[PDB]
């Protein structure tokens, strides 16, 4: 599936820093036409990164599929010991200030070479040596910035409840509205994204909007280019009009982030307005380029059935009858196709209606409370008459003991 | 089939194959007023229009169904229609089963009288 | 009209296949047969309690 609508100019632009060289290990697989240039960058890209043990990764996986270069990786593996002399010093000093104000720095460096599992088991057992408040603002990032490389959860939400209401609600006032860097924008980014990934949408985009785009630009957690669209899908398919309106037309801090990509923002739009056949059109083109996000891909079939379901849900709201074609044509279908749909929508209880398939109309049912509870009342009625004889039929056989041997 | 048939259970088994046409039926009373013939067969896998009509047709003689068929333009309605709650007949349905939870709450209160004029009882309350 | 309605403003449906709007002067004091669906609930929950309350 060929995308040459793809503008790289904006693309190259949209990621910066590490999220480059990732991207590139699915698209790779069906873009060639690009090995050639990619090695006159890899002049200077080689050194980068401090690969080791990712070299021999990329070279084997198409050559299994379908020396100057080899002298490189030999070199730099001496580079791994010299690092281990700066920890001896540390030890011997036996001074508690050394060893925490150097831990940090040296936190982030393991990090990058891809010792991951060395760097994470510092802080498990640092923690019982930190017993100053400020200790504990340091260590919540640290954590959950090396836990999303991993790939878990389990443990950033058993630690997230408990810092904001351990310590009196963040310390009360907040300690002069945290330090220089505001964690407070922080964790409202990190948990949408563990909450995305938890198959919790509605979550997700409620800890997104809550974002401001003064102190929303680190390179190092999620691209703010994606930060809208992850914001912006969540919250269409999973919050109603009421929520839509509040949360995202209205919000002042995410509109700035609308700026960003003039698509998104017209999707909403598009929906708020009751203009589905455009809106549903834009998502149609932009759902291709989703599917290479990597927090994004797995949930994009679930959202883009939650809104399209939402939009029908809404369309057919202020209508008691509804012309099928014209339903049809707002959604880019078949008449038929539309029906097909519109069947399982009324089984599973979403939408209240019947489909008049001889002058293809649909129209709304208005349920009779009095009939309703009459019949509901006598099914209750002979249900516990059934009941109270066959319990005291029960009675009869415990009370003469009757059971088979 | 040896499994059904050693159990001597032969007909009901095959009653269970009517009864799921039957069922899907139902369930297309709940999402259309009006479906052709021909559309019906397709979804509950009748094989032709005129099996349909007899299947419907069937229906409604038993009263399982509340609809009715249109030879003129091939189609089936549904009229969903089955009982106001404001007949006389309505109200002797009613006092028909309240006399019967009256009864049984007279049985009820009956052998429990039994059970505190037991001698066995009393002595262990 | 469409607008309206989603935003709780009017109070009514459309009618597309004959361009109707039909308001909604209707839906008057019928909480009795709420009251008796809470009523029915209670009353089925409670039947199960009855006859299961140890075996």
């Not at chain 1, 834009?282 to 927090?295: G, H, I, P, Q, V």
């Not at chain 1, 009858?321 to 707002?330: G, K, L, N, T, W």
């Not at chain 3, 109707?20 to 009251?35: P, S």
Request: glycine fraction near 4%.
């Amino acid at each position: 599936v060929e995308n040459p609508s793809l503008d790289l100019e904006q693309y190259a632009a949209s990621y910066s820093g590490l999220m480059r060289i990732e991207r590139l290990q699915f698209i790779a697989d069906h873009c060639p036409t690009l090995r050639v240039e990619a090695l006159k960058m890899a002049l200077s890209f080689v050194q980068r990164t401090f690969n080791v043990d990712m070299y021999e990764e990329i070279h084997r996986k198409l050559s299994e599929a379908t020396a100057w270069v080899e002298a490189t990786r030999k070199k730099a593996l001496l580079k791994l010991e010299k690092l281990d002399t700066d920890l001896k010093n540390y030890k011997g000093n036996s001074i508690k200030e050394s060893i925490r104000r150097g831990h940090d720095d040296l936190g982030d460096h393991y990090l990058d070479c891809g010792d991951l599992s060395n760097a994470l088991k510092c802080y498990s057992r640092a923690r019982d040596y930190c017993t100053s408040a400020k200790h504990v603002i340091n260590m919540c990032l640290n954590v959950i910035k090396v836990s999303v490389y991993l790939q878990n959860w389990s443990h950033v939400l058993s630690y997230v409840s408990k810092a904001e209401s351990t310590p009196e609600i963040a310390e009360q006032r907040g300690e002069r509205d945290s330090q220089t860097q505001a964690i407070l924008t922080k964790l409202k980014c990190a948990a949408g994204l563990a909450e995305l990934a938890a198959r919790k949408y509605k979550q997700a985009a409620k800890c997104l909007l809550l974002a401001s785009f003064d102190h929303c630009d680190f390179p190092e957690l999620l691209s703010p280019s994606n930060v809208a669209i992850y914001g912006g899908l969540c919250a269409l398919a999973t919050f109603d009009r009421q929520e839509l309106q509040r949360n995202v037309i209205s919000s002042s801090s995410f509109k700035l982030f609308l700026e960003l990509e003039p698509q998104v923002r017209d999707i909403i739009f598009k929906f708020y307005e009751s203009k589905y056949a455009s809106c549903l059109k834009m998502l149609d083109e932009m759902k291709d380029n989703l599917l290479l996000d990597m927090y994004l891909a797995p949930h994009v079939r679930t959202l883009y059935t939650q809104i399209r379901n939402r939009a029908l849900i809404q369309y057919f709201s202020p209508y008691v009858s509804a012309d099928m074609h014209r339903m049809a044509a707002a959604f880019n279908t078949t008449v038929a196709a539309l029906e097909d749909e519109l069947t399982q929508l009324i089984l599973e209880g979403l939408i209240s209606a019947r489909v008049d398939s001889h002058s293809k109309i649909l129209y709304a049912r208005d349920v009779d409370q009095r009939s309703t509870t009459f019949e509901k009342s006598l099914l209750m009625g002979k249900e516990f008459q059934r009941r109270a004889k066959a319990m005291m039929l029960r009675a009869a056989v415990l009370r003469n003991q009757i059971h088979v041997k | 089939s040896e499994t059904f048939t050693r159990d001597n259970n032969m007909g009901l088994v095959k009653q269970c194959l009517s009864s799921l046409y039957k069922k899907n039926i139902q369930r297309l009373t709940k999402t259309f007023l009006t479906l052709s013939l021909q559309d019906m067969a397709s979804r509950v896998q009748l094989s032709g229009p005129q099996e349909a009509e007899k299947y419907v047709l069937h229906m409604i003689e038993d009263g399982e169904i509340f609809a009715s068929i249109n030879q003129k333009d091939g189609m089936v309605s549904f009229h969903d229609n089955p009982e106001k709650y404001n007949n006389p007949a309505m109200l002797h349905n009613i006092d028909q089963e309240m006399l019967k939870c009256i009864e049984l709450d007279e049985r009820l209160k009956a052998m429990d009288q039994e059970i505190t004029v037991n001698p066995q009882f009393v002595q262990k309350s | 009209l469409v607008q309206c309605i989603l935003d709780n403003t009017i109070h009514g449906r459309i009618d597309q296949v004959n361009q109707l709007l039909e308001l909604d002067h209707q839906k008057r004091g019928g909480a009795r047969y709420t009251a008796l669906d809470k009523w029915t609930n209670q009353l089925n929950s409670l039947n199960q309690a009855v006859v299961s309350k140890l075996a």
